[PDB]
């Protein structure tokens, strides 16, 4: 709860990459795509709709961690 | 040309091309024009999904 | 001579007073703010002034920590201090039961005397100081930021806030001029306040190692 | 200055004899006693009072 | 008010209109504005015409006269300085020799 | 016949615009000749490349 | 006669040349000393010199004389001045990070192979940068396990 | 002779660039090989690969050099205020005086979302607000503008016109820009510094 509430660009890139890799491997879609044959476009649509089922696990340098939902974080 | 500098830090990769550049203002700043000949050679593996 | 030498002596005495005030020892405001006229009143000539004895200081006590703790300042008259002078100073401190002493050399210290002073005794702490360095106060320099030695409680609070260890803090050598100016030992932490370009300040910390 | 023996042409050094300082050569018994004052000025260049620039 | 130039449309430093668009309304708006500029400016530049010729760099009569007078004055002053240094005493600038 | 002017923004940095009709009528037409050499040598044994 | 005129009678032996620079500010024209020497302590200790506002270009002398933080500040100021001299600007955070990396172990360590070896611990990077065989054989002798951090 | 001298100068420039290429290439290689280990952690502390801390906070404040709008400053308050006034001109709200501006600024700044912001930025915002309030006071004293809002020439209110809506918009925009200009954790700050020094 102490880190920045804004979702960084690295987190965005990694989440979009993981979601595109999953969707490319026959993952279920939660935004009801309309003729999008590119998995990255579907991942971006899910991110804009805030329906990505991925929780970022931010690790502190000492060893502590904290979980943040994609819908909980702030996007730009 | 050692292993560290020539084969570990910087190495050669496939699925790449090299071509001379020419101006084209009718394209967006985030877009780049690729020739048809190179496009037929550089392939992308797409997984079959629903 | 007899004009620049007394000025150097007065400035060295003022710098020593400032160093003792920064370390926490008891010095009155008159000793800190001492004009050249008062120093001339004490002694206005080089032969009248006594470097080995008339300038020695023994009233230096850590009033904040313990009045019983005593610190001494030496001013050897010879340019190069030998083993015999170090032994005389050590036996005098043994007589007066003083554990902390400073040696303000005039030109330098012989390597044998340096090695002996390094391993005199763990209880007898003696620091070598050149008069050339003491002619200017390091703290008053514009490049040198404000350094404050933190207590064990503050170091514990820092380590708890940042979830760090002692070895993970930035290092600073014991032979650093500021480190010898403050007389900090291995394991102590110093907070440094760097003046930023704006009205704010940057707080950093360094561990002596 | 640099002086040489008229006999053989080697360099002359300054030594002290039994009566007075004399020029002598290391390879011949030639000597020469000093009668009056002998001087050799060099006139080194005097550093000028450098101007204040800026 | 004002006319666009490198100080406002170039890649020199801040105060650029595209930089203001990027910092105020995001990346997409700046990209669209740059695309519209790159698609508009060449069309108008071609329809208006912009050419350089040998007559665009030729000197005028007043320019030639001024250049001749300035060359004469400079050569006379340089000859005076040469004569002052070679024959006589020349005012030596601080921090440097006479040469 | 070169005309120094800006046209269509396809000559931004050092580029030049060519005329299609000019290239169609032989302007700039070039020929590249390459050589392919082969050798049929006799070895130590009494056999030859055929 | 070969070395009698070459004896020092007054001044700092390390100091080779000092000039009187002047600032012609409209409020007042002030005088400062520009010394082409390698002894900052002696210059500060001299009479009539305001040692509180004396800087230098040699980072090693500043480190040895006024501490590691003064050395960091001198590095920052000198890098920024050298960059501004060419008309190109760099954000101060980059040079601050560089100075902090050079001055985080209490001693100014350079970017050369020696300073990089004194700062870094990874054997693979030390071998890849410079002195491959020497570093590899030294690591094999010490048996130093290298992580993948 | 002039052509020969010009060719000499051109060849001097050419050899200078030829030496500069290799020299800066080697310098860039060294700088990147030395600085590639540093990274910005999530606790706002720059640490090396072994875990040792290089800086408790990057640059002393923690702002992104790529998102630096001003001259080594996060925001240009004058341009931001002008943009807020231009984008959201409220014609149905009266102007604010010096006291009213200071009061609304102090009321808005004491909210919860401004607590997590750094103190230096808040002090700079207070300084800019005090400066613009002094400017408005000087204008109203020059032109005799009354704070009651009953002056006959209403065009006098158009000299320095400020409304609490514009104040809130300006403060929220400054807060959002300062929050979005901070160093995003995980960025390779060392490589960026090496490149921005070598180039
Ligand atoms: Zn002879």
The answer to whether B49 and F39 are in contact (CB under 8 A) is no
Range(s) of chain C covered by CATH 3.90.940.20: 137-209
Calpha distance H69→H75 (Å, rounded): 6
Strand bridging mode C108-109 / C80-81:
parallel
From ligand 1's centre to the CA of G3, what distance in Å? 27
Strand ranges (E), chain G: 18-24, 29-35
Q: What is the largest CA-CA distance in chain A?
A: 46
CB atoms within 10 A of CB C144: 20
The two structure tokens encoding residue B49 = 């999904």
CA angle H165, H170, H175 (to 5 degrees): 125
Residue of H nearest to C202 (CA): H60
Say whether H174 sits in a helix, a strand or coil.
helix
The answer to whether C192 and C142 are in contact (CB under 8 A) is no
The answer to whether A73 and A6 are in contact (CB under 8 A) is yes
CA-based nearest residue to G123, from H49, H190, H30: H49
Residues of D in contact with G9 (CB under 8 A): none
CA G106 to chain centre: 13
Best H2, H65, H69 member to test E by mutation, with max E CBs in 10 Å, is H69
Asked if C171's CB is within 8 angstroms of G104's CB, the reply is yes
The answer to whether C150 and C189 are in contact (CB under 8 A) is yes
CA angle H124, H127, H130 (to 5 degrees): 150
Calpha distance H191→H199 (Å, rounded): 12
- Deposited resolution, Å: 2.8
Strand order in the sheet with C171-172: C146-150, C189-195, C201-208, C171-172
The answer to whether C6 and C40 are in contact (CB under 8 A) is yes
Calpha distance G92→C198 (Å, rounded): 13
Please state at what angle helix C83-96 crosses helix C111-118, rounded to 10 degrees: 30
Say whether H5 sits in a helix, a strand or coil.
helix
Q: Which CATH superfamily is domain C137-209 in?
A: RPB5-like RNA polymerase subunit (3.90.940.20)
Residues of H with CB under 8 A from a CB of A: 41-43, 45, 47, 51, 179-180, 182, 184-187
Alpha-carbon distance values, H34 to B10, G80, H53 (Å): 17, 20, 16
User: For chain A, which domains are there?
Assistant: 1-76 (3.90.940.10)
Place of tokens 């620091």: C127
Range(s) of chain C covered by CATH 3.40.1340.10: 1-136
Calpha distance D54→G32 (Å, rounded): 10
CA H167 to chain centre: 18
- List CB contacts of D6: < 8 A, sequence separation 6 or more: D30
The answer to whether C86 and C116 are in contact (CB under 8 A) is yes
From ligand 1's centre to the CA of D23, what distance in Å? 10
The answer to whether A40 and A20 are in contact (CB under 8 A) is yes
The two structure tokens encoding residue H91 = 């014609």
Calpha distance H99→C120 (Å, rounded): 69
Calpha distance G125→C66 (Å, rounded): 52
* Sign, Cα dihedral of C171, C174, C179, C185: positive
Give rounded-to-5 percent helix, strand, coil for chain H: 60, 5, 35
Q: Which CATH superfamily is domain C1-136 in?
A: RNA polymerase, Rpb5, N-terminal domain (3.40.1340.10)
CA C23 to chain centre: 8
CA-based nearest residue to A15, from A59, A58, A57, A52: A52
Strand order in the sheet with C66-74: C57-62, C66-74, C100-105, C125-130
Task: Give strand pairing partners of G30.
Answer: G23
**Residue C49: what are its φ and ψ, rounded to 5°?**
-75, 135
The answer to whether A74 and A7 are in contact (CB under 8 A) is yes
CA angle H131, H132, H136 (to 5 degrees): 120
Calpha distance G127→G138 (Å, rounded): 10
The answer to whether H104 and H166 are in contact (CB under 8 A) is no
Asked if G19's CB is within 8 angstroms of D44's CB, the reply is no
Place of tokens 């740059």: E34
Asked if F13's CB is within 8 angstroms of B25's CB, the reply is no
Calpha distance H28→C140 (Å, rounded): 38
């Amino acid at each position: 709860r102490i880190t920045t509430p804004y979702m960084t660009k690295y987190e965005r890139a990694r989440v979009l990459g993981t979601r595109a890799l999953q969707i490319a491997m026959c993952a279920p879609v939660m935004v009801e795509l309309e003729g999008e044959t590119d998995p990255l476009l579907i991942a971006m649509k899910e991110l804009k709709a805030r329906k990505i089922p991925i929780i970022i696990r931010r690790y502190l340098p000492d060893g502590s961690y904290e979980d943040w939902g994609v819908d909980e974080l702030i996007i730009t | 040309q050692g292993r560290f500098r020539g084969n570990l830090s910087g190495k050669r990769v496939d699925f790449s091309g090299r071509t001379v550049i020419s101006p084209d203002p009718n394209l967006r700043i985030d877009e780049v024009a690729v020739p048809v000949h190179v496009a037929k050679i550089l392939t992308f593996p797409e997984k079959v999904n629903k | 001579d007899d004009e620049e030498e007394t000025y150097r002596l007065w400035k060295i005495r003022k710098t020593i007073m400032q160093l003792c005030h920064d370390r926490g020892y008891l010095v009155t405001q008159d000793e800190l703010d001492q004009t050249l006229e008062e120093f001339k009143a004490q002694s206005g000539d080089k032969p009248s002034e006594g470097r080995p004895r008339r300038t020695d200081l023994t009233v230096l006590v850590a009033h904040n920590d313990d009045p019983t703790d005593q610190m001494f300042v030496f001013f050897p008259e010879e340019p190069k201090v030998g083993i015999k002078t170090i032994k005389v100073y050590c036996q005098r401190m043994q007589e007066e039961n003083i554990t902390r002493a400073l040696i303000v050399v005039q030109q330098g210290m012989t390597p044998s005397a340096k090695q002996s002073l390094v391993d005199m005794a763990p209880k007898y702490i003696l620091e070598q100081f050149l008069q050339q360095e003491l002619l200017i106060n390091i703290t008053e320099h514009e490049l040198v930021p404000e350094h404050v030695v933190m207590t064990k409680e503050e170091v514990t609070e820092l380590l708890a806030r940042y979830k760090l260890r002692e070895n993970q803090l930035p290092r600073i050598q014991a032979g650093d001029p500021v480190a010898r100016y403050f007389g900090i030992k291995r394991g102590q932490v110093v907070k440094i306040i760097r003046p930023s370009e704006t009205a704010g300040r940057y707080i950093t910390y360094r561990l002596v190692q | 200055m640099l002086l040489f023996c008229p006999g053989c042409g080697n360099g002359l050094i300054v030594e002290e004899g039994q009566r007075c300082h004399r020029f002598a050569c290391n390879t011949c018994p030639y000597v020469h006693n000093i009668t009056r004052k002998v001087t050799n000025r060099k006139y080194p260049k005097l550093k000028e009072v450098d101007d204040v620039l800026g | 008010s004002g006319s666009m130039d490198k100080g406002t449309l170039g890649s020199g430093s801040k105060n650029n209109i595209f930089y203001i668009l990027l910092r105020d309304w995001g990346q997409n708006e700046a990209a669209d504005a740059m695309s519209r500029l790159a698609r508009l400016a060449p069309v108008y530049l071609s329809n208006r015409g912009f050419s350089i010729g040998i007559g665009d760099v030729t000197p005028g009569q007043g320019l030639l006269k001024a250049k001749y007078e300035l060359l004469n004055a400079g050569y006379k002053k340089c000859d005076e300085y040469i004569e002052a240094l070679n024959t006589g005493k020349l005012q030596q600038q601080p921090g440097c020799t006479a040469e | 016949t070169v005309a120094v002017m800006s046209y269509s923004g396809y000559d931004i940095e050092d580029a030049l615009v060519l005329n299609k009709a000019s290239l169609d009528r032989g302007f700039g037409r070039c020929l590249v000749y390459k050589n392919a050499k082969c050798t049929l040598k006799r070895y130590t044994n009494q056999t030859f490349d055929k | 006669k070969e070395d009698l005129p070459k004896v020092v009678v007054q001044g700092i032996p390390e100091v080779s040349r000092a000039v009187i620079h002047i600032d012609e500010q409209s409020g007042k024209e002030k005088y400062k000393l520009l010394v082409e020497g390698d002894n900052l302590r002696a210059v500060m200790a001299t009479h009539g010199v305001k040692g509180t506002r004396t800087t230098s270009n040699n980072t090693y002398e500043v480190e040895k004389t006024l501490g590691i933080e003064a050395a960091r500040t001198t590095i920052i100021n000198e890098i920024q001045y050298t960059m501004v001299n060419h008309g190109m600007s760099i954000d101060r955070r980059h040079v601050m990070l560089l100075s902090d990396l050079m001055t985080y172990k209490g001693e100014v360590l350079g970017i050369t192979r020696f300073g990089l070896a004194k700062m870094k611990e990874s054997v693979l990077m030390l071998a890849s940068f410079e002195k491959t065989a020497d570093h590899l054989f030294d690591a094999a002798y010490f048996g130093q396990k290298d992580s993948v951090c | 002779t002039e052509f020969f001298f010009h060719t000499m100068a051109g060849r001097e420039g050419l050899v200078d660039t030829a030496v500069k290429t290799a020299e800066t290439g080697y310098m860039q290689r060294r700088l990147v090989k030395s600085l590639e280990d540093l990274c910005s952690q999530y606790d706002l502390t720059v640490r090396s690969s072994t875990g040792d801390i290089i800086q408790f906070i990057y640059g002393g404040d923690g702002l992104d050099p790529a998102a630096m709008e001003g001259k080594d400053e996060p925001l240009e308050f004058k341009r931001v205020l002008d943009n807020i006034k231009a984008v959201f001109p409220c014609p149905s709200e009266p102007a604010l005086s010096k006291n009213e501006l200071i009061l609304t600024t102090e009321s808005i700044m004491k909210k919860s979302e401004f607590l997590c912001c750094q103190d230096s930025f808040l002090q700079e915002i207070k300084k800019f607000i005090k400066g613009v309030s002094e400017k408005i006071k000087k204008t109203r004293d020059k032109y005799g503008i009354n704070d009651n809002g009953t002056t006959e020439p209403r065009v006098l209110y158009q000299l320095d016109r400020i409304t609490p809506t514009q104040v809130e918009k300006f403060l929220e925009t400054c807060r959002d820009k300062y929050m979005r200009a901070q160093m995003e954790p995980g960025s390779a700050v060392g490589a960026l510094c090496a490149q921005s020094i070598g180039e």
